[PDB]
C-alpha cells in the first residue's frame, strides 16, 4: 500500500536546526522592503512585511488589484500582481525570508548558558564574542606553521604571522570566521582522537571532561545537524497576521512589536548591501555588520545584548522568544488558562430542597447556554421554519421555548466548578433544574468538597457538548459517583453544620420530659406521639424495633426487640435503611458518629442506599434543627463565677515574683519566665472552670429532688455536636483569651484578662490586632505555598498512570501500626486497609491461610485480620512495582471514590499530587515548609552521619579540622576511613561495633544516606512516616499510597556502577536500566549485566528530566529547553499527559487510554 504524502493524523514531532535551503522551503517570497502599507489605500506595498504577493490576499477569495473577484477563480495567479486568490486565512500561514548580506550568529546558540557554538568548537564564549565584534582575529585550519587552530590573534600579530606565512595559514574575523570554523570542523576525527586520548592518560580531571565532550560530539553527529546552521545565512519572516497591523476606532492603528524589529533587520541589511556596492571603507561596513548582528539578535531574542526599545515608547519591544515564553511565570496559554465557549458563572445560593445529584440553574443562563441545542430542537419538532426563525423565537422569548428547554435539559448534565480548584472534587457534574432568578443553587452536602461558603463565592458552569462528554460527566464527574475522598476512603458527603445540630438535638436525652418511661409499639407511633405534643422529642423510653442484619450469606436476617432508647432516636430510625443495626442511632449522634453512620451504610448496603440515606439525613437534619428553635443569646455564654478570684490569686503571684526581683532573689529572665508561667497556668484554670460550668451545670429534677446532666445550653450543643465552634473559641468567648505576642516573637507578660462577652479596652484590642493581621497574612501566604507545592507535585508525577494489570511481584513493604512512644498514634487496620497482600498470612497457628496471597483487603478481610491477633502484614506498594513506565493496578490499592480496585488507565500521579496538595492549607522545624523540605530531598542544616559499613570502629590520626574514623569489618578489608570533623560531639562508641546506618552522631539525616546505607524500603519509609507525622499532627488524613507514588517518581533515576553496554556513571531511568539488564541476563551477552545504584532526586529536580521536550517547554525555562533539544534533534513521541494537552488531542489516560493503547501497539509493529 502506498504509504502517504498529504495530511494524515500525525504522530510524534521533531525539532532541529534549520538549513538555509530548509528555511527557503517555507518562504514563499523574499521581503525586500521595510514598507508595511501604502498609507492611503491601506493595501499592502508589494515585497514588504505585509504583502499580498508573498503572503496572501487582503480579503477572502479576491485578488489585490481586483481583477479576479469571483469565487470561481481560485488556483489563479493574477497576471498583474501575482496573488493566488484564496481565503485570507493563508495570510496566517505562509512564511517568508530575508537573505542576509553577511552571515549572522543566532543569539540562542551564542548566549545559551552552555554556549553551543562555544562547546561544539571547544572555544570560550568571550573569545567568540571578541571575534564577532571584530575586536580580534581568529585562526582557522592553521595547517603546520606556528599556530593552533582555534588560536586568537591581534591586528599586529595577524600581520606579522601573515608576513611570515602567506599561505598554509588562515585567519578570519567576524561572523564569517566563526561560520568558517564550524564548517571546517570534522566531528568524526575529533571522536577518534578523543577516544584515544581518553584511553591513554589516567587522571580524573582529564577523562571526566574527555568523556563528557566525546558524548556531546557523537550526540550532535547522530542528530543530523551540521554546525554551520548555528550561523544564520537566511532569516525567516513570520506570517503577517501573527503580527497584524489591524485598524482601531478613531482611525488609529495598532501593531505587534515584531514589525518594528523586523523592519530594522531589513533596513540595515539592505543598507549593508548598499555599503558593499559603494565600496565603503572597512570601519564602516564593519559597524554595519555589527549593527545587523544586534538587530537580528534583538528580533530573535531581545535582552541578551542591548534591550532595544520600541518607537516613541520606553517599554522594551517584545521579541519572538518573548512570544514563545509567554508570562505569569511558566505558562504556555494552555497552562495559565484558555477562554471556553458554552460556559458561564454567578453568585451561588443554597437550595436545600435539591437531591444530591442536581443543582439549581438560572433560567436565563440555561437559555443562553443551550442556545444551539434549543435552535436545533425547535426546528426538529417543526416549531420554527428555519434556524434564523428559531433565533428570532428564543430572542423574543416566546412562551413555547421554555418547554423545549425543559426537553434539552433533562438528561443533559452540566459541570460546576469553584475558584480555587485543588483536588478533583473542585469540579462536579450535576443535573440542571430550571430555576427562576439569577443565582445558581448548590446542594449543601457538596459545599464541603468545594470549600464553598455562602458569603458571595461564585461558581462557573460548563456544558458537556459531545455525547462522550455527557457520559463522562454522568459516569465520572457526577456528584453521586464521588461520595468518598480520593485521599482517604472516608465520606466527603458528611453532613456539615445545621444538619448535624438537627440530628444531635434529635437524638439526645434530658433527665425528665413528657412521655418518660412509657412504651410504644414502633417508631411510627413514636413520631405520632411527638408531633401531637404528647411526648417530648428527647425522653428515655422503651420501644419495640425491628432491625436487620445481612450477616447470613448475601441475605438479610431480621430481629425484633424492646430497645431502651429515646423518642428522637426512635423517630430517626425510620430513615435508616435495612441491614444497619439500631445500635448506630441509639447514641447522641455527633458530627463524628453521624459520619460513621454513612460510612458503615456504604460498606454494607452499597452505593444507592448510601446516597438516598445521605439525602434523607440532610432533609431531616434541616427540618428538625428548624423545629428545635436553637438560637444564640448574650446570656448563652456563661462566665465562671470564680474567674475574678483566679485572676486575683494569679495576680498575687506576679507581684510576689516582682517583689523577689526587687530584692534580687530572682534574675530578670527567670522572673519573666516565672510570671509568664503563672499567667499561663491561670488561663488554663479559667478555661477548665468555664468548661465545667458551661458543660454540666444544668441541674434538674426527676421524681426526686435533683440530678445533673450535660447542658442543653445552645452554644454548648453547637460546639459539642461538631456543628460549629470549638473549645478554644468558646474559651475566648467566656473565659479570658490568651497571652498575645509582640511582632518580634516575644510574648507579652500581661495577658488579656477580659474576653468578648465583656468588653476589651484600648490596649487589649490593639494587641489583638497584630495577632489578627498576622493570621490573615500567614493563611493567605500558606494558600500560595500549598499551590506551589501541588504544582511541583503534579509536575513530578503526571504521566504516571495505571498501565499493566498485574506485574506479579511478591515485593512490598512491611505494614505495622505506627505505635509512637505512647499507645498507637494510628492502627494497623487503617494502614493496611484497601491495600493488597504481598503474600499469604498466618494465624497464630499455621497451614491455615486466612488471606491467600494477593487479595484486596476490604473491611471484612481487615476485621478477620483483627479477630486474630496478627500484628504484621506485608503489602504491595506502588514504589516496588515491577511494571516499567507506569503502575499495575494490582500494586496500587483499591482506593477511589468507589470501593472497588483501581481501574486500568486511571491517572494516579495527578490524583496523588492533588490528594497531598488540597489539605496543605490546614498545615502550620515542622510544618508545610517541612513537607516541602522532605519532598525536595534537601540535606538538613546540621545532619547526623551513619556508619558506612558494619564492624568495630576506632578513632585515628589527629586534629586537622577532621579527626579520622577507621572502620574494621570482621572478615572483609578495612580501608574505609571517613573524615569526621571532631568539633562535632560524637555518639559512636570508640570500643563498640556499629551496624551500617547506626548513629555516629546526632541530628536529622539526609534521605540520600538512608537510601544508600539503609536501602530503598528504608528511605521510602522515612519519607512517608515523616511527612505523615507532619500531616497527622494537624489531623489531616492522607493515605500512604499517594506519598508512595511521589516517592517512586523521586527515585526514578539511578547511577550505574558496572558496565558492558552503556556508560559508567550516567544517571538514568531504572525502568530503562532494569528492563535492559533483565534483557541482558539472558540471550544477548550470556550475562554482561551491569550493577547500578539507586538515586534520590528531589521532586523539583526529578521533574527536570522529561523525554518529551514539548512537555518540558511548558513548566521549565522555555528558551533553554528548546535550544538544548534542538541541537540533539530530539524527537518527541508525546505519550504523556501535558504534551497531549498542549497539542490538543486525547489524554493517554482514562477514557482516552483505550485510544492511545490501540495506537501505541499499532505503532512499532506490523
Amino acid at each position: 500500500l502506498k504509504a502517504q504524502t498529504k495530511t494524515e493524523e500525525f504522530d510524534a514531532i521533531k525539532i532541529a536546526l534549520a538549513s538555509p535551503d530548509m528555511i527557503r522551503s517555507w518562504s514563499f517570497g523574499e521581503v525586500k522592503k521595510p514598507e508595511t502599507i501604502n498609507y492611503r489605500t491601506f493595501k499592502p506595498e508589494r515585497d514588504g512585511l505585509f504583502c499580498a504577493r508573498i503572503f496572501g490576499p487582503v480579503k477572502d477569495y479576491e485578488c489585490l488589484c481586483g481583477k479576479y473577484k469571483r469565487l470561481k477563480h481560485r488556483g489563479v495567479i493574477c497576471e498583474k500582481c501575482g496573488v493566488e486568490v484564496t481565503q485570507t486565512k493563508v495570510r496566517r500561514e505562509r512564511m517568508g525570508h530575508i537573505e542576509l548580506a553577511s552571515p549572522t550568529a543566532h543569539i540562542w546558540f551564542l548566549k545559551s548558558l552552555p554556549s553551543r557554538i562555544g562547546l561544539l568548537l571547544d572555544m570560550p564564549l568571550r573569545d567568540i564574542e571578541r571575534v564577532l565584534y571584530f575586536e580580534s582575529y581568529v585562526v582557522i585550519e592553521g595547517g603546520m606553521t606556528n599556530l593552533e587552530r582555534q588560536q586568537i590573534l591581534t591586528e599586529e600579530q595577524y600581520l606579522d604571522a601573515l608576513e611570515e606565512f602567506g599561505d598554509e595559514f588562515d585567519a578570519k574575523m567576524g561572523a564569517e570566521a566563526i561560520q568558517a570554523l564550524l564548517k571546517s570542523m570534522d566531528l568524526e576525527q575529533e571522536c577518534e582522537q578523543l577516544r584515544e586520548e581518553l584511553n591513554e592518560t589516567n587522571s580524573e580531571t582529564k577523562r571526566k571532561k574527555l568523556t563528557k565532550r566525546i558524548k556531546l560530539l557523537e550526540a550532535f553527529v547522530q542528530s543530523g545537524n551540521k554546525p554551520e546552521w548555528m550561523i544564520l545565512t537566511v532569516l525567516p519572516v513570520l506570517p503577517p497576521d501573527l503580527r497584524p497591523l489591524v485598524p482601531l476606532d478613531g482611525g488609529r492603528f495598532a501593531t505587534s512589536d515584531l514589525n518594528d524589529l523586523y523592519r530594522r533587520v531589513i533596513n540595515r541589511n539592505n543598507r549593508l548591501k548598499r555599503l558593499l556596492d559603494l565600496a565603503a571603507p572597512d570601519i564602516i561596513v564593519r559597524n554595519e555588520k555589527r549593527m545587523l548582528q544586534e538587530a537580528v539578535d534583538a528580533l530573535l531574542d531581545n535582552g541578551r545584548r542591548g534591550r532595544a526599545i520600541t518607537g516613541s515608547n520606553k517599554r522594551p519591544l517584545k521579541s519572538l522568544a518573548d512570544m514563545i515564553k509567554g508570562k505569569q511565570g511558566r505558562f504556555r496559554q494552555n497552562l495559565l488558562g484558555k477562554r471556553v465557549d458554552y460556559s458561564g458563572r454567578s453568585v451561588i445560593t443554597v437550595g436545600p430542597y435539591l437531591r444530591l445529584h442536581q443543582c439549581g440553574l438560572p433560567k436565563k443562563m440555561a437559555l443562553e447556554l443551550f442556545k444551539p441545542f434549543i435552535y436545533g430542537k425547535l426546528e426538529l419538532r417543526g416549531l420554527a421554519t428555519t434556524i434564523k426563525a428559531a433565533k428570532k423565537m428564543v430572542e423574543r422569548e416566546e412562551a413555547v421555548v421554555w418547554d423545549i428547554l425543559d426537553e434539552v435539559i433533562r438528561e443533559h448534565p452540566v459541570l460546576l466548578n469553584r475558584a480555587p480548584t485543588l483536588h478533583r472534587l473542585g469540579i462536579q457534574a450535576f443535573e440542571p433544574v430550571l430555576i427562576e432568578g439569577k443565582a445558581i443553587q448548590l446542594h449543601p452536602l457538596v459545599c464541603a468538597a468545594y470549600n464553598a461558603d455562602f458569603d458571595g463565592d461564585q461558581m462557573a458552569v460548563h456544558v458537556p457538548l459531545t455525547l462522550e462528554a455527557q457520559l463522562e460527566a454522568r459516569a465520572l464527574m457526577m456528584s453521586t459517583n464521588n461520595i468518598l475522598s480520593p485521599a482517604n476512603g472516608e465520606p466527603i458527603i458528611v453532613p456539615s453544620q445545621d444538619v448535624v445540630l438537627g440530628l444531635y438535638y434529635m437524638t439526645r436525652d434530658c433527665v425528665n420530659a413528657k412521655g418518660e418511661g412509657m412504651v410504644l409499639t414502633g417508631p411510627k407511633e413514636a413520631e405520632r406521639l411527638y408531633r401531637s405534643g404528647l411526648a417530648s422529642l428527647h425522653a428515655r423510653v422503651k420501644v419495640r424495633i425491628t432491625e436487620y442484619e445481612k450477616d447470613a450469606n448475601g441475605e438479610l436476617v431480621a430481629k425484633t426487640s424492646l430497645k431502651d432508647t429515646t423518642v428522637g432516636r426512635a423517630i430517626l430510625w425510620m430513615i435508616v435503611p435495612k441491614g444497619l443495626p439500631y445500635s448506630i442511632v441509639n447514641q447522641a449522634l455527633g458530627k463524628k458518629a453521624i459520619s460513621k453512620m454513612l460510612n458503615t451504610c456504604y460498606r454494607i448496603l452499597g452505593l444507592k442506599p448510601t446516597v438516598i440515606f445521605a439525602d434523607q439525613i440532610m432533609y431531616t437534619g434541616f427540618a428538625y434543627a428548624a423545629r428545635s428553635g436553637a438560637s444564640v443569646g448574650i446570656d448563652d455564654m456563661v462566665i465562671p463565677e470564680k474567674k475574678h478570684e483566679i485572676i486575683s490569686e494569679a495576680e498575687a503571684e506576679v507581684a510576689e515574683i516582682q517583689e523577689q526581683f526587687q530584692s534580687g532573689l530572682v534574675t530578670a529572665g527567670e522572673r519573666y519566665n516565672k510570671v509568664i508561667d503563672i499567667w499561663a497556668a491561670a488561663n488554663d484554670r479559667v478555661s477548665k472552670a468555664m468548661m465545667d460550668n458551661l458543660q454540666t451545670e444544668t441541674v434538674i429534677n426527676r421524681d426526686g429532688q435533683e440530678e445533673k446532666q450535660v447542658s442543653f445550653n445552645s452554644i454548648y450543643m453547637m460546639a459539642d455536636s461538631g456543628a460549629r465552634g470549638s473549645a478554644a473559641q468558646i474559651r475566648q468567648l467566656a473565659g479570658m483569651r490568651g497571652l498575645m505576642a509582640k511582632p518580634d516573637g516575644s510574648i507579652i507578660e500581661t495577658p488579656i484578662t477580659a474576653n468578648f462577652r465583656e468588653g476589651l479596652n484600648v490596649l487589649q484590642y490593639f494587641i489583638s490586632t497584630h495577632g489578627a493581621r498576622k493570621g490573615l497574612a500567614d493563611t493567605a501566604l500558606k494558600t500560595a505555598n500549598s499551590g506551589y507545592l501541588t504544582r511541583r507535585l503534579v509536575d513530578v508525577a503526571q504521566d504516571l498512570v495505571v498501565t499493566e494489570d498485574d506485574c506479579g511481584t511478591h515485593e512490598g513493604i512491611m505494614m505495622t501500626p505506627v505505635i509512637e512512644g505512647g499507645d498507637v498514634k494510628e492502627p494497623l487496620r487503617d494502614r493496611v486497609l484497601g491495600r493488597v497482600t504481598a503474600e499469604d498470612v498466618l494465624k497464630p497457628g499455621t497451614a491455615d491461610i486466612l488471606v491467600p496471597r494477593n487479595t484486596l483487603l476490604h473491611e471484612q478481610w481487615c476485621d478477620l485480620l483483627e479477630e486474630n491477633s496478627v500484628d504484621a502484614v506485608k503489602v504491595r506498594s506502588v514504589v516496588s512495582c515491577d511494571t516499567d513506565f507506569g503502575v499495575c493496578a494490582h500494586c496500587y490499592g483499591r482506593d477511589l471514590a468507589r470501593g472497588h480496585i483501581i481501574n486500568k488507565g486511571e491517572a494516579i500521579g495527578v490524583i496523588a499530587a492533588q490528594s497531598i496538595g488540597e489539605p496543605g492549607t490546614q498545615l502550620t522545624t515542622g510544618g508545610l515548609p517541612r513537607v516541602a523540605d522532605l519532598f525536595e530531598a534537601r540535606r538538613p542544616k546540621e545532619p547526623a552521619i551513619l556508619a558506612e559499613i558494619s564492624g568495630i570502629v576506632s578513632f585515628g590520626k589527629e586534629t586537622k579540622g577532621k579527626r579520622r574514623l577507621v572502620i574494621t569489618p570482621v572478615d572483609g578489608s578495612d580501608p574505609y576511613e571517613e573524615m569526621i570533623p571532631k568539633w562535632r560531639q560524637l555518639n559512636v562508641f570508640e570500643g563498640e561495633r556499629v551496624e551500617r546506618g547506626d548513629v555516629i552522631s546526632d541530628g536529622p539525616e539526609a534521605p540520600h544516606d538512608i537510601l544508600r546505607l539503609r536501602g530503598v524500603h528504608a528511605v521510602t519509609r522515612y519519607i512517608v512516616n515523616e511527612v505523615q507525622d507532619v500531616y497527622r499532627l494537624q489531623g489531616v488524613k492522607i493515605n500512604d499510597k499517594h506519598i508512595e507514588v511521589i516517592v517512586r517518581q523521586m527515585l526514578r533515576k539511578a547511577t550505574i556502577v558496572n558496565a558492558g553496554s552503556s556508560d559508567f556513571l550516567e544517571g538514568e531511568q531504572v525502568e530503562y536500566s532494569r528492563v535492559k539488564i533483565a534483557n541482558r541476563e539472558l540471550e544477548a551477552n550470556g550475562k554482561v549485566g551491569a550493577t547500578y545504584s539507586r538515586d534520590l532526586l528531589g521532586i523539583t529536580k526529578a521533574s527536570l528530566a522529561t523525554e518529551s521536550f514539548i512537555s518540558a517547554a511548558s513548566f521549565q525555562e522555555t528558551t533553554r529547553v528548546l535550544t538544548e533539544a534542538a541541537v540533539a534533534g530530539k524527537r518527541d513521541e508525546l505519550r504523556g499527559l501535558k504534551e497531549n494537552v498542549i497539542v490538543g488531542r486525547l489524554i493517554p489516560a482514562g477514557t482516552g487510554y483505550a485510544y492511545h493503547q490501540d495506537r501505541m501497539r499499532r505503532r512499532a509493529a506490523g
Partner: protein, 470 residues
C-alpha cells in the same frame, strides 16, 4: 575593554584615525585626481572604446536613443554636440588608415578628442566592464594554452614563458618549438589539436579590439592601478572625516531612528561628498561635506523612520502645522481651533483633519492595560473578519431551502433559474448565454424566468423562503 554596545566598538575604532591637516586634504585630493585620470586615459587608448561611442552616436541621430544616455556633455547643445562628434569621427577616420610608424602622433591625439567627452557614469561603467571582460576572454586562452601543456602534457612553465612573451599568436611558438627535442617537446603533440583551434579567439581579439594581445593587458592594467589609487585616497579621506558625521548625527537623535543608523546613513553621505568634491574651487571640505551628511540623515529619516511610510511633502506639511500650533498655543491662551491652523496654511484647509490623523504613529499592540497583568492591548482586539456560526448554519440551511424549492418547478425552469444565478455552478450566465445553451433564445428565456419567479412568489412555496429575510 569592550563593553559591547556597538556604538562603543565603533567610537573607539574610528577614534584611532588621526584628524587631517589642511595640507593633507589637498594631498589626498591630488592623489584622487591622479588615480582617476589614469583610468580615463586608459579608456582613451582603447579602439573599441572609440568605435563604440561612434556606433552609439550613430544610433542617437537615428532616434534609437537620446543625447542624455550617452554624454552628460563634453568639456562644454545638440548642434555643438553634433559638430564635436563630427570632430571625434574625423580623428578616427584619419588615425585608422595611418596604421601603415608615424600613426602614433595621431593615435595620441585620437585619445585627446575622446577625452573631451564627459560620459554618463553608466556608459563609462559599461566601457570599463567591457574591457575587464575582454581581459577575462584573454585569460581563458592564456590558461587553456598553459594547462594543456604544463598540467596535461607535462611541460615545465620555465621553458613555457620563453617563446610566449612578445608573440602568443602566430605559429612560431606552437609549430616550431615542438621539434626542439626537449623532454617536454614530443609531449606537446597529444594536445595540439585542442590548442591550435582555441588560438582562434585569441588571434581574433587583436581584430575586434584592434590591439595585439601585448597592449590589451598593459592598458587596462594601468587602468586597474589608477582605480586602486583612487579608491585608496578617497577611503582615506572618509575615514579621516568620520568625526564630522558623528557630530552632525547628534542633532537628529530622537527623530525616530537609532544613533548608529543615523551615523551610518551620514557616513554614506560623507562617501558621496568625497565622490563629488573638487578642491580646485577653494571651498572648504568641512562645510561642503556637512551639507551632504545632513542631507543623507534627513532624507533617510523621512523615508524609513515610520511604520507607515509617508511622502516627503506630507511630512514637511505636518511640521509646518506644528510650527503654527506652537505660537498659537499660548497666543490664543487655550489652543487654536482644529480649523484655525487651516487658514494660516495655503492649501484647501479641510485637509487638516486627514493629514493630522494619518500622521499618527500606530500604538504598540503590546501596550499594557490594567492590573499590570498579561492583558495587553492586542489581547482585546477581536476578529471582525470572522463569520458567526449562528449565520453559517443559516447558509447551510438556505442551501437546503433553495435546493428544495428548485425541485418544485419544471426541470427547464429549474435549469434556467439555476443558470440565471450562480446556484451550484461556476460563475453565472448572461441571458444570451442561457439562450445558446438552451437553443431557445433571447426574450423567450427571460419570460420563463418571470413566470418561474411567479410560481415561487405566491405562497405554498413562499412560506419557507420568506422567513429568510429579516
Amino acid at each position: 575593554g569592550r563593553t559591547t554596545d556597538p556604538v562603543r566598538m565603533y567610537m573607539r575604532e574610528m577614534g584611532t584615525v588621526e584628524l587631517l591637516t589642511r595640507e593633507g586634504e589637498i594631498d589626498i585630493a591630488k592623489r584622487i585626481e591622479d588615480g582617476i585620470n589614469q583610468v580615463q586615459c586608459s579608456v582613451a587608448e582603447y579602439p573599441e572604446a572609440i568605435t563604440y561611442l561612434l556606433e552609439q552616436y550613430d544610433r542617437v541621430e537615428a532616434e534609437e536613443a537620446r543625447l542624455s544616455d550617452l554624454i552628460t556633455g563634453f568639456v562644454d547643445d545638440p548642434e555643438l554636440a553634433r559638430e564635436k562628434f563630427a570632430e571625434l569621427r574625423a580623428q578616427y577616420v584619419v588615425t585608422r588608415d595611418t596604421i601603415k610608424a608615424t600613426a602614433q602622433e595621431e593615435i595620441l591625439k585620437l585619445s585627446e578628442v575622446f577625452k573631451q567627452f564627459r560620459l554618463v557614469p553608466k556608459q563609462f561603467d559599461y566601457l570599463v566592464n567591457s574591457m575587464r571582460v575582454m581581459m577575462d576572454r584573454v585569460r581563458t586562452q592564456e590558461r587553456l594554452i598553459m594547462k594543456l601543456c604544463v598540467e596535461q602534457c607535462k611541460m615545465p612553465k620555465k621553458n613555457f614563458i620563453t617563446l610566449f612573451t612578445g608573440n602568443e599568436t602566430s605559429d612560431t611558438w606552437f609549430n616550431a618549438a615542438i621539434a626542439m627535442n626537449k623532454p617536454w617537446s614530443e609531449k606537446l603533440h597529444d594536445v595540439s589539436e585542442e590548442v591550435h583551434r582555441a588560438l582562434q579567439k585569441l588571434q581574433q581579439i587583436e581584430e575586434e579590439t584592434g590591439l595585439t594581445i601585448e597592449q590589451v593587458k598593459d592598458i587596462n592594467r594601468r587602468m586597474s592601478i589608477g582605480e586602486a589609487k583612487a579608491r585608496r585616497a578617497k577611503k582615506e579621506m572618509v575615514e579621516a572625516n568620520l568625526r564630522l558625521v558623528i557630530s552632525i548625527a547628534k542633532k537628529y537623535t530622537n527623530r525616530g531612528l537609532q544613533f548608529l543608523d543615523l551615523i551610518q546613513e551620514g557616513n554614506i553621505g560623507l562617501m558621496k561628498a568625497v565622490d563629488k568634491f573638487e578642491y580646485r574651487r577653494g571651498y572648504k571640505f568641512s562645510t561642503y561635506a556637512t551639507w551632504w551628511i545632513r542631507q543623507a540623515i534627513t532624507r533617510s529619516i523621512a523615508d524609513q523612520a515610520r511604520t507607515i511610510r509617508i511622502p516627503v511633502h506630507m511630512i514637511e506639511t505636518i511640521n509646518k502645522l506644528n510650527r503654527i500650533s506652537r505660537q498659537m498655543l499660548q497666543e490664543m491662551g487655550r489652543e487654536p481651533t482644529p480649523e484655525e491652523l487651516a487658514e494660516r496654511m495655503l492649501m484647501p484647509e479641510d485637509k487638516i483633519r486627514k493629514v493630522l490623523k494619518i500622521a499618527k504613529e500606530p500604538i504598540s499592540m503590546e501596550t499594557p492595560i490594567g492590573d499590570d497583568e498579561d492583558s495587553h492591548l492586542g489581547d482585546f482586539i477581536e476578529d471582525t473578519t470572522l463569520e458567526l456560526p449562528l449565520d453559517s448554519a443559516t447558509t447551510e440551511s438556505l442551501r437546503a431551502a433553495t435546493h428544495d424549492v428548485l425541485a418544485g418547478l419544471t426541470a427547464r425552469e429549474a435549469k434556467v433559474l439555476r443558470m440565471r444565478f450562480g446556484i451550484d455552478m461556476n460563475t453565472d450566465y448572461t441571458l444570451e448565454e442561457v439562450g445558446k445553451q438552451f437553443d431557445v433564445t433571447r426574450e423567450r428565456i427571460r419570460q420563463i424566468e418571470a413566470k418561474a419567479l411567479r410560481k415561487l412568489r405566491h405562497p405554498s412555496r413562499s412560506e419557507v423562503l420568506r422567513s429568510f429575510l429579516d
